[PDB]
């Protein structure tokens, strides 16, 4: 474990989420049909378990349009960063755009402190 790789991994996660957003921030209404579960708290790395659990539904929604390759990259990164917590979900749910923006925000938060 060390701080260079951790920092590089978070920036690559952040970028992958923005890539997804930009791909759809360009069937859009149908993709907005689906609601995603959201973290009640997301301040530190272990809270990425809330992201991991939602990656299978994310890939399903994206497949209504290279999805698998971007999602599996994100999955590999989320597992390293969260390391080796039971996710606590909020009661409000989010569209895919609200979902990506919350996790993009979360990444930016961790990165700036490093």
């Amino acid at each position, epitope marked *: 474990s060390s701080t260079k790789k951790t920092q590089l991994q978070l920036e690559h996660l952040l970028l992958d989420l923005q890539m997804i957003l930009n791909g759809i921030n360009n069937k859009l*209404t149908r993709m*907005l*049909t*689906f*609601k995603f*579960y959201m973290p009640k708290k997301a301040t530190e790395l272990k809270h990425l378990q809330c992201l991991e659990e939602e990656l*299978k*539904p994310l890939e*399903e929604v994206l497949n209504l349009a290279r999805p698998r390759d971007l999602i599996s990259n994100i999955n590999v990164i989320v597992l390293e960063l969260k390391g080796s917590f039971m996710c606590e*979900y*909020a*009661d*409000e*749910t989010a*569209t895919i755009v609200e979902f990506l923006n919350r996790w993009i925000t979360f990444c930016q938060s961790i990165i700036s402190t490093l």
Partner: single-chain antibody
Amino acid sequence: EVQLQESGPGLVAPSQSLSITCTVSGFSLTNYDISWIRQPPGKGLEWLGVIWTGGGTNYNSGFMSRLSITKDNSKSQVFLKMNSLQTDDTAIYYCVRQGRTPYWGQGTLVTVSDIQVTQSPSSLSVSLGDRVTITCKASKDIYNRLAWYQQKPGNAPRLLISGATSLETGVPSRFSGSGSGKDYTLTITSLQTEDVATYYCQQFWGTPYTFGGGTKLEIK
């Protein structure tokens, strides 16, 4: 304190329109989607449509052309309007806060003058005590977007389980939810006289938010 309250016209002529108002308190319509559901007397639950936080709507395919759902975020009110009425439209109408844990209104009676989801025994006829399983199987993966409900004659449905496996607050631990992917189960252990009811599953992975056919449980 979360509340939803449906106000309807009671009695309507068949050549007129039906309008119902759902007034909510304890939360904002800018943060939660609202579904409309109905239940013809003696029949199962059916989902009519939803109005999203951002203001768009999705409708049940069989009603779409005669329905209009709108809302006023500042008055905390949602409006259902239905045209071309039929005698078939006599039903109890409910509005539902559609978060991770759904919250139901009381339901107002109006009298007029796709992922498929298959629910297990249509009816169960048990002995006091006993352990029973009800299954709900979906056409495709629904990623734990599944709720179980209990309905007793003359009352609104009560939420037992949400997110496929999460026991709700105040619900006896004799009720348990399990499953993953496409097949989900409700288990009631050592069931009791208080458990005589009709039980329903509902999926909410994408619209329509379809209900199972119901399981009517009775001590026999």
